[PDB]
Amino acid sequence: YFQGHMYNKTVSINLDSRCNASCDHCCFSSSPTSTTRMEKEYIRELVTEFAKNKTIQVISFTGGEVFLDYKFLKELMEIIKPYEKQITLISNGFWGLSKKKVQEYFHDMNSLNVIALTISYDEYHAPFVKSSSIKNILEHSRKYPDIDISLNMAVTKDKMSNHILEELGDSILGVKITKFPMISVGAAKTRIKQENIHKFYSLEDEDSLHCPGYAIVYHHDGEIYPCCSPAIFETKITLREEYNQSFERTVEKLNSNLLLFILRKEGFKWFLNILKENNKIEEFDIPYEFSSICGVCGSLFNSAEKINYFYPYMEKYYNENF
């Protein structure tokens, strides 16, 4: 039906860049002193709109650390509750230190339709959160089979989290664990040696270079991104045109965005072939090797000059097709 929009069923909101941790890989460079965030009242309005929206099924919350201002998170989950939307959360699990706190939060999550909780723990998070805190959360989650539990571990060649998993003991039984490489963005750009980042892809294997898929995120910088990959936040791709924009308008802009249409239909080779034919790979600092497809994305579109360079080619594509 031309505009079918298979992106209006989920939305993510990044509540704050503030975090109790200061992870050396952090794509947001989050820390207790981070000040980037949308205003609380503005977030209440966004959440109220997402709860009332008839197509949205799932609302996800991320940061930063969303459990740091738990009173506000619970307040937003209560706005959604009469509308019966599903909620997902991601956390560093610092709150797991008290088993009593873990029991209160799980009681709330279960009564507020939280269907998934992802806990991030690895050698990068370890200086900030104790292993026992993660174990308390993972162990208590067994009492709530309707909450899908995941453990996400960000790794490098020198920090593969092998001993982290062992210290977690049997608390990880039944938990989906995913170890993933670093995206070279934020604190990972300056605090991690590039040689320690796993390189799985190169500029020549163009057949594997396809975006995994779009998902709308209202970010703590006040912008709107087409996915939640750490790489996207340093790009200049935004779906925001004004302060008070509806989700119908955000979805319409995502579906009519020519760059994103070309990226989805043609893959990253359409853009890489333009830079290669114009001898711009070195001028635009495209890395030869990357840890993920998102690494190409971030390097192609992380400046106004780099994005604008494609505009005459996109205009030609629009005229040729359609």
Ligand X SMILES: Nc1ncnc2c1ncn2[C@@H]1O[C@H](CSCC[C@H](N)C(=O)O)[C@@H](O)[C@H]1O
Binding-site residues sit at 19, 23, 26
The two structure tokens encoding residue 57? 């099924």
Nearest 5°: phi and psi at 70?
Answer: -65, -35
Candidate list 120, 133, 171, 302; residue touching ligand X; CB under 6 A: 120
CA nearest neighbour of 229 among 271, 308, 310, 291: 291
Task: Give burial (CB, 10 Å; 0-12/13-18/19+) of 249.
Answer: middle
Which CB sits closer to ligand SF4, 46 or 66? 66
Each residue 207-246 as x (binds ligand X by CB under 6 A) or -, in order, gives -----------------------x----------------
Tell me which DSSP letter residue 22 carries. -
Q: Distance (Å, rounded) from C-alpha 307 to C-alpha 258? A: 12
Q: Within 177-206, which residues bind ligand X (CB under 6 A)?
A: 182-183, 185-186, 188
Candidate list 17, 29, 60, 92; residue touching ligand X; CB under 6 A: 92
Which CB sits closer to ligand SF4, 25 or 85? 25
Stretch that binds ligand SF4, among 22-30, 75-83, 248-256, 270-278 (CB under 6 A): 22-30
The one of ligand SF4, ligand X, its own copies, none whose footprint includes residue 22, by CB under 5 to 8 A per kind, is ligand SF4
Q: Return the SS3 of 76.
A: helix
Tell me if 166 contacts its own copies by CB under 8 A: yes
Q: Distance (Å, rounded) from C-alpha 227 to C-alpha 260? A: 11
Each residue 183-222 as x (binds its own copies by CB under 8 A) or -, in order, gives ---------------x-xx---x-xx-x-x----------
DSSP bridge pairs for 179: 153
What DSSP element (H or E) covers 259?
Answer: helix 258-266
Q: Distance (Å, rounded) from C-alpha 13 to C-alpha 22? A: 21
Residue count of the chain, please give it. 322
Q: Shortest distance, CB of residue 62 to ligand SF4, whole angstroms?
A: 8
Q: Which residues are annotated as a binding site for [4Fe-4S] cluster?
A: 19, 23, 26
Tell me if 139 contacts its own copies by CB under 8 A: yes
Q: Distance (Å, rounded) from C-alpha 100 to C-alpha 94? A: 13
Bond into 64 cis (ω within 30): yes
Q: Distance (Å, rounded) from C-alpha 282 to C-alpha 115? A: 45
DSSP for 150-199, written as a single string: EEEEE-BTTB--HHHHHHTGGGGTT-EEEEEPPPS-THHHHHS-GGGS--
Which CB sits closer to its own copies, 29 or 292? 292
Each residue 113-152 as x (binds ligand SF4 by CB under 6 A) or -, in order, gives -------x----x---------------------------
Candidate list 12, 29, 53, 91; residue touching ligand X; CB under 6 A: 91
Candidate list 32, 169, 212, 312; residue touching ligand SF4; CB under 6 A: 212
Q: Distance (Å, rounded) from C-alpha 175 to C-alpha 118? A: 10
Q: Shortest distance, CB of residue 81 to ligand SF4, whole angstroms?
A: 26
Tell me if 174 contacts its own copies by CB under 8 A: yes
Which CB sits closer to its own copies, 160 or 314? 160
Tell me if 265 contacts its own copies by CB under 8 A: no
Stretch that binds ligand X, among 76-84, 89-97, 217-225, 269-277 (CB under 6 A): 89-97
Q: Distance (Å, rounded) from C-alpha 72 to C-alpha 90? A: 15
Residues lying near ligand SF4 in the complex (CB under 6 A): 19, 21-23, 26, 28, 30, 63-65, 92, 120, 125, 211-212, 226-227, 229, 231-232, 293-294, 297
